[PDB]
Symmetry: D2
Subunit: 213 residues, 4 copies
């Protein structure tokens, strides 16, 4: 619908230490904007940069142009799931999955998050990340499902960037029309948070396009 709700729970671990986060939000799928409030329920205070989780906290929240097949809006009411590997340039790897279903007007997420091999003096365990930069994801079809890759980066305290290579697989639960090669522009931002990030208000803006011209 023009205005949808979000309900979510994430369970996971970072370098073996487990935690849990729940969230509630709302957004406009046809405008490509969304926002949510996240609450840490287990494993607080989190000893890692919150930023590594933010892109796991839904490509249905992306404004798709008419000449571009929309894989995500097609997959409802049944929904879809996605898998992702997030490979940071210092060897830290985060694996995340999301099972997305629809109940009335509210999307429901079942998220699992697992990070390993973050060095203790790195920007993630030391919390020296500022935010994610805007990015452009590339989407193409492979083995009857939709892939999404993007080489992005996090800005660091005092300048410089921390790169991360995203590899996402999107699987609609039911068979939908497959799209051509296209792009999605992203901008995710933490707009407010408390000292230990037990409460986080997170926003994303996403728009699909087909590149130049």
């Amino acid at each position: 619908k023009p205005d949808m709700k979000i309900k979510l729970r994430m369970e996971g671990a970072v370098n073996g230490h487990p935690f849990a986060i729940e969230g509630v939000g709302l957004g406009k799928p046809f405008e490509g904007k969304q926002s949510m409030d996240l609450k840490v329920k287990e494993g607080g205070p989190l000893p890692f940069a919150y930023d590594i989780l933010t892109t796991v906290f839904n490509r249905v929240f992306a404004k798709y142009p008419e000449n571009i097949v929309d894989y995500f809006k097609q997959s409802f009411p049944e929904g879809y799931s996605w898998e992702r590997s997030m490979n940071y340039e210092d060897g830290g790897i985060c694996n995340a999955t999301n099972d997305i279903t629809l109940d009335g007007d509210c999307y429901i997420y079942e998220i699992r998050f697992d990070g390993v091999n973050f060095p203790a003096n790195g920007p993630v365990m030391q919390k020296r990340t500022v935010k994610w930069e805007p990015s452009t994801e590339k989407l193409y079809v492979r083995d009857g499902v939709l892939k999404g890759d993007v080489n992005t980066a996090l800005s660091l305290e005092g300048g410089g960037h921390y790169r991360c290579d995203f590899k996402t697989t999107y699987k609609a639960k039911k068979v939908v029309q497959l799209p051509d090669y296209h792009f999605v522009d992203h901008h995710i931002e933490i707009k407010s948070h408390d000292k230990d990030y037990s409460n986080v208000n997170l926003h994303e803006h996403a728009e699909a396009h087909s590149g130049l011209p």
Copy 2:
């Protein structure tokens, strides 16, 4: 504190391509000879829809024969124990993250294991169970930032011939400060010795020895 005849008790909770499962095991082995064996049972999520082989190297470098001219990081870490973290990067994009918290209760090592695999193509040898076994391997172990790292590029043999490659990145963290070793190697040979039709029961063996390369 470390005795020629130790026991293994383990539980793994995890998921592959989003589908969860759980496996328990009971084992035994000889740390000073570098040999071990266990019986594993699927307790949740069976029958497993992926090749069992991707899990076996998660199911303890204390079971490796270390010569005396090589500092033994793992046997030093007991009785307090150690933990390890690992990424396993398959050449077709399948990636498995696993963690193991290892403690010691009397004569039995106890594992708390987490396993999470993503992005395995449905047409690949992991989801279609076309792996035969792990080949023998030689791991590279070195120190970085006060902890021990171990990297190895190995492979799985496939049923119509050929090999399916995997890059290992392990971080070993002793629970308290031990002597750190110099650059060395561990030779591995892990084998499934018997199993069920669906791999609900698996008998797993490993043989390991540390060395220093040529000569």
Copy 3:
């Protein structure tokens, strides 16, 4: 130093899976429009046994339209010029490293290019010539240790459908000190417009435009 119309002169020497070749080209473009076109000729090692597409992005981010609010690293570097390094990483392990030394003579840029590709499998799309073209792309550019870096993972479309991925890592080096830009993007669309049977003659075009991501940028006045 930068004129609305510029010329291009280049020579590329290199090898793929150990077999050497050489290519010369002449071109023209408009740096402030971010467009260029050239004519390329194989001079050595023909006919080439690999897909020509792996060479095209080696054949000048000075040919990229920069908005007025984004610092332009490349147009600043002339008349002295700049150099760049890059090593493409294709998903089946075939890897190409490339270098370009770019200088200026009057109104003509001059390239000295080296291209070296290794480990292309015989049954892969490069050695079997099953690539159609490069898809449009969006490059990510950021600063590291006083020089400009460029990352983008893009793809080639394949003859029977589907895509063949490649990871780009470029380093750009101005020869003299210039102003460094913030993290930004460059959109690309490179196209082979015409070629003969064995790709002896190739007409190649590129369109490149810089932006700042987010909400793409005319407001009634």
Copy 4:
């Protein structure tokens, strides 16, 4: 075709971060004992501004001791010889691509080598010459598409301690049809034994043995 004492003659042309150089070498070794040594001389581009260590493993798996139960792909390929392709992926993004055409003239192997490295950061151990030596390694060899592959993640020890990692991917191509081996390993130990101040003269050694993993192989009679 293979005699217990063979000689080596080589020339390498290449560049690192765009700056070209050339090195010639003369050597000797015992293929059946897996040992070799050579003396290398910089002929162009000296003094080299990068750590010499990145070139040493490019300066022939015929010099590897094979047990009788493991098929020898390399000693089989002569007198025709073989060629190999290789990418070396360092953990900070430095990438070196190398090719070698190995031929045989009498009792002397002849190498034609190309070496091309890009994106080595200026503050890294290669451009600062902070490497000490390659650690010994164990390469893993397997067959793919009828040719021989070699993978090994290895490392260089660094001046102030610690290690600098590199990912090797080699493709070996015999010039004639030979019998293909099963999955096996080769243990390596390459050493610079002497060099002059700026590495214009370098004496280089390698020791190599193939095996089949543990249990490492008289049985007391």
